[PDB]
Amino acid sequence: ELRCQCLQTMAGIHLKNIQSLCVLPSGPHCTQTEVIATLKNGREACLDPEAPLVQKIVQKMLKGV
Amino acid sequence: LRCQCLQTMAGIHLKNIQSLCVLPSGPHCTQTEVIATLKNGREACLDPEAPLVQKIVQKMLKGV
């Protein structure tokens, strides 16, 4: 909890807007795994890896959409 | 605007990756591309279609 890149997780993300989704696994840097989705507009959104929706979007990116 | 991967590599394990990032398919690139920077710090392009990469990605999300 000393060099984490996310101060909060938020929900409501849609795959259509995402240009890049990246998973930061937990380590000495941060207590919890973090999902950062940089959208096509250039903004970034912190997502909670445990959430089902984010996992569904990841699996849709790899296979689908 | 263009693909970030000029090749594909195999043998990367969830234990070895320090950060994995998925770039979805679009006009920039025909195929979805996964770029995993390893604990050693070098980067490896992984093939999203492979079952192993998908399983490892979702395992990372779970916390493995």
Swiss-Prot record, chain A:
Source organism, top-level taxon: Eukaryota
Disulfide linkage: C4-C30, C6-C46
Protein name: KC(5-72)
The organism's taxonomic lineage, starting at the top: Eukaryota, Metazoa, Chordata, Craniata, Vertebrata
